Amino acid sequence: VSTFPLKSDINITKSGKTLLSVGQGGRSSRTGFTATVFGGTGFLGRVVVSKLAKHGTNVVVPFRNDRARRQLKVNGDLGVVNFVEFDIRNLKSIEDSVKYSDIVINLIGTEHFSKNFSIEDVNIGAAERIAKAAKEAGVSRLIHVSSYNANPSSSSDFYATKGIGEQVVRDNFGPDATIVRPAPMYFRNSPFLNELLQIKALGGNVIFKKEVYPVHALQVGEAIERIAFDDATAGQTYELFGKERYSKKELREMIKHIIHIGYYPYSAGFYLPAPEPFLYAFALIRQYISSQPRFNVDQLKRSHINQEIDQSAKTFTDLGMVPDELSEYLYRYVKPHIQNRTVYSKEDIEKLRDYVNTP
Amino acid sequence: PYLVAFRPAVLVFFFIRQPIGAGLLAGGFLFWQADRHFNFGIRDNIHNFKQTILGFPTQASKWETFKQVDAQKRAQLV
Numbered sequence A: 001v002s003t004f005p006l007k008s009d010i011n012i013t014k015s016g017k018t019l020l021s022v023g024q025g026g027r028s029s030r031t032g033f034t035a036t037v038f039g040g041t042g043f044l045g046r047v048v049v050s051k052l053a054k055h056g057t058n059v060v061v062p063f064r065n066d067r068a069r070r071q072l073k074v075n076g077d078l079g080v081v082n083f084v085e086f087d088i089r090n091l092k093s094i095e096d097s098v099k100y101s102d103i104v105i106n107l108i109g110t111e112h113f114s115k116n117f118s119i120e121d122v123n124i125g126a127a128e129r130i131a132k133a134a135k136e137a138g139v140s141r142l143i144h145v146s147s148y149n150a151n152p153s154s155s156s157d158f159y160a161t162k163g164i165g166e167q168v169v170r171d172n173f174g175p176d177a178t179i180v181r182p183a184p185m186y187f188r189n190s191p192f193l194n195e196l197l198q199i200k201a202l203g204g205n206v207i208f209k210k211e212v213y214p215v216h217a218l219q220v221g222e223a224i225e226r227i228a229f230d231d232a233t234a235g236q237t238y239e240l241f242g243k244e245r246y247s248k249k250e251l252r253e254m255i256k257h258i259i260h261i262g263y264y265p266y267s268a269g270f271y272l273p274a275p276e277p278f279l280y281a282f283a284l285i286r287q288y289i290s291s292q293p294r295f296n297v298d299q300l301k302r303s304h305i306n307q308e309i310d311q312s313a314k315t316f317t318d319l320g321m322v323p324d325e326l327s328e329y330l331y332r333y334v335k336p337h338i339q340n341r342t343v344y345s346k347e348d349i350e351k352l353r354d355y356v357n358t359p
Numbered sequence B: 001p002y003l004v005a006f007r008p009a010v011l012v013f014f015f016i017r018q019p020i021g022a023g024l025l026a027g028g029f030l031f032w033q034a035d036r037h038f039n040f041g042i043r044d045n046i047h048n049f050k051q052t053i054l055g056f057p058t059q060a061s062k063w064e065t066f067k068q069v070d071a072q073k074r075a076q077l078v
């Protein structure tokens, strides 16, 4: 960001287009690109879209929810943010969002299968159609986002399909495609944190014993931004994660202690020891009775699997960015949910973390 | 008659607000209601224990008192 994102004013894409950026990088400036951000209306998209538009890149955001795309237009200027109605089952609408696009970003990825899509149909079927269709329109660069633990042979549906999503893209878009693996990001209304703040978290012991490498969502938002303007980063695999290792159960008590939540945790439902069959049965029952995406069977297995760093991939420093730690930002993102306010600074998170580990 | 209308609301708000506590006080309430339904004899014997220790006239003591009066009067006829 700073004042101007582009490294050089004139950039030539892989397709021979010669794009000249104008202006000093303000709202009324431009960069001559057209970055189609699939799944832009999601949690991750609203950061990817926001950074691209403010610096003058045209953003084509294909949406399926009409009332969620309205707020994305504030970020850009007049004509900067464009909208296309689409569904992954409508091939023609896909080709409307890639015809004029020089950058194509893929963010579509689900954890719960619905009555219209399975986990494979989205992490693969959407990705395969999106990647292959983009190539036929002469898209210069493709960027993809997968799980942080992609594995073709994993028994977890999410990790198995996300891994195959990496293969099927590279057999469709080709060598130019890029794959970026984000660690669980934390931000306002982050799905990673929304499970920790929920008071009635059945199976809290089982769900929160998993391990992670939390990463600030803004940096990943800029991580795609750095990759977008550069052609040197084609055909790579990137895994983005935070230095200091944290576990959900370590966070859950750390989160609760900041909110100061005697008898209350024992009664309101903070700790709900429930049998393993009951958790498996409850998730299956809601899967046919619920109407909103609930806790899934897949996240019962993932809770037993810890995050794995892959050494074949490249870190933040490969892009010149130093990742930020959850300690410097965990307090502010739960500040909404918390005499004299005690602000738990960066260093003081350890002293909180110390208080959790002490029996 | 106001609690009969207000009872549906508060019971709902007791389980939502404090679900673990609700499952015990309501669960414990059903135990004694069942206990009196099924003549389990528990609360009766918890009661008789207190009357014995604190010197009260227990149910067994009266029936023992009647036996002493009954046995005395019968031998008075003889």
Ligand SMILES: NC(=O)C1=CN([C@@H]2O[C@H](COP(=O)(O)OP(=O)(O)OC[C@H]3O[C@@H](n4cnc5c(N)ncnc54)[C@H](OP(=O)(O)O)[C@@H]3O)[C@@H](O)[C@H]2O)C=CC1
Residues within 6 Å of the ligand: A038, A039, A040, A041, A042, A043, A044, A045, A063, A064, A065, A068, A087, A088, A107, A108, A109, A110, A111, A117, A122, A145, A146, A147, A148, A182, A183, A184, A185, A186, A190, A191, A192
């Ligand atoms: N910190 C995080 O959030 C995590 C990041 N990831 C992965 O990063 C990727 C980014 O997703 P994220 O934004 O973070 O979370 P979201 O689940 O909110 O992103 C979902 C986006 O993809 C769209 N989507 C899902 N299914 C479909 C479908 N059948 N058809 C069309 N669109 C669909 C959604 O559309 P819409 O919302 O408009 O309905 C939305 O735009 C995901 O794959 C995620 O699993 C990995 C672990 C956690």
